[PDB]
């Protein structure tokens, strides 16, 4: 597990977040006081979840912070952010740092709240961030990056050396921000069709899509959509993936 | 109520459990017991004692069906072979054929992968 150590990049992250009132801000994983303090400072009042009840006591008893935040002590994947968006008057800014096994769940739970979230701002490991922003025709591309880029516009904020962290890992990591689309540029009939199309395709990414999505559609459907079935799964943009999803859903 | 006597006894022993079953000469089951039904779970389920107790439970079941003769065969890699068959010597029968009948393949199909432990 990790949390940051050096004021230069702490200050860079909290300043790049631009946390002020007129925003429905909520931290998750406040962790070490050093990086939760500047955001709880700049916001006149701030909401937070900590997963740990002991750290939640450490910070809630801290007079810089307990008087200056409202604090919650539970697994955030239980947490009803759609009601917190109502209680905070406008859709949320959700942000912070974590041990990040939970990362994959965080994204899906955030996406379960794409209406209730205004934006997300989080640190993550280099490979998963570069995947999350990957262009369709790259080895870094794939199913989770597809779903992420489907739900939101995604934007690297800044990148951080491993010696910057309190227990310094071996692994460089970056803060990234993302934005649930105000209207989906890719309208879809359902997301489960996307999720299964993408998993089938990426479970078979070395073979032709005739030997991946063509295990379900015909070649004449695919070419009828304007898609060459002789491509590989990692040639395919989210645009034609959502077109396939709509085709599956509407022809079923 | 049926009384017959010609008996084949099968011991099916494994590192989780030992089943024991009694059959006629035809191979038709007369009755059976395990260890797990003897009541032991987890670690106790695969012990020489639990395999004796399983044999006692079968010995009671055959008292109702047949008891004069038995031919006992043994299978699976598990513990308690001696323990369960000497528990057939309880209410002892007149038996003479013993070998295992443990399945050995002549280079049969791919076993599971080893545990990463």
């Amino acid at each position: 597990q990790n949390f940051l150590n050096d004021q230069f990049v702490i200050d860079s992250i909290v300043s790049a977040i631009n946390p002020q009132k007129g925003q429905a801000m909520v931290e998750i994983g406040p962790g070490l006081a050093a990086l939760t303090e500047p955001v709880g400072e700049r916001l006149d009042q701030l909401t937070v979840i900590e997963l740990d009840r002991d750290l939640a006591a450490r910070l809630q008893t801290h007079p810089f912070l307990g008087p200056k935040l409202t604090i919650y002590q539970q697994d955030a994947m239980t947490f009803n952010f759609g009601e917190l968006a109502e209680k905070m008057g406008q859709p949320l800014r959700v942000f912070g740092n974590l041990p990040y096994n939970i990362s994959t769940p965080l994204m899906f739970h955030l996406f379960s709240y794409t209406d209730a979230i205004a934006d997300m701002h989080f640190m993550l490991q280099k490979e998963v961030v570069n995947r999350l922003v990957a262009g369709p025709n790259s080895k870094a591309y794939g199913r989770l990056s597809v779903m992420a880029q489907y739900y939101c516009n995604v934007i690297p904020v800044l990148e951080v050396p491993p010696s910057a962290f309190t227990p310094p890992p071996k692994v460089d990591s970056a803060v990234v921000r993302l934005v649930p689309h105000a209207t989906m540029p890719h309208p879809v009939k359902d997301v489960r069709v996307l999720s299964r199309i993408t998993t089938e395709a990426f479970n078979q990414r070395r073979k032709t899509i005739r030997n991946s999505l063509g295990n379900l559609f015909s070649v004449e459907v695919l070419t009828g959509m304007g898609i060459d079935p002789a491509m590989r799964a990692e040639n395919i943009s989210v645009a034609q993936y959502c077109q396939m999803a709509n085709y599956l859903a509407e022809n079923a | 109520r049926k009384q017959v006597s010609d008996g084949v006894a099968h011991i099916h022993a494994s590192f989780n459990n030992t089943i024991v079953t009694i059959t006629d000469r035809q191979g038709n089951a007369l009755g059976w017991a395990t260890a797990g039904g003897s009541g032991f779970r987890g670690s106790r389920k695969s012990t020489p004692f639990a395999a004796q107790v399983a044999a006692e439970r079968c010995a009671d079941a055959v008292k109702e069906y047949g008891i004069k003769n038995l031919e006992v065969m043994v299978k699976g890699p598990g513990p308690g072979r001696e323990s369960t068959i000497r528990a057939l010597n309880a209410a002892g029968f007149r038996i003479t054929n013993i070998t295992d009948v443990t399945p050995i393949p002549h280079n049969g199909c791919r076993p599971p992968k080893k545990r990463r432990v």
Partner: protein, 65 residues
């Protein structure tokens, strides 16, 4: 060794079940050559012979069958 070498020097054999029985376990498996005392040349011939003898049910494969 030299007495077992004479067993090889004298003969090369298949269908002599009486001699094949000198080189099998009761469970029907082939005996390893070091235990037979015979030289590897004859061990190969014996193995080939035993395989044929099993094919024609002259010898069992196992104890049971």
């Amino acid at each position: 060794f030299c007495r077992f070498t004479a067993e090889g020097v004298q003969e090369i054999d298949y269908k002599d079940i009486a001699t094949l029985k000198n080189y099998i376990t009761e469970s029907g498996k082939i005996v390893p050559s070091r235990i037979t005392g015979t030289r590897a040349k004859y061990q190969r011939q014996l193995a080939r012979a035993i395989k044929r003898a099993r094919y024609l049910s002259l010898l069992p494969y196992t104890d049971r069958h």
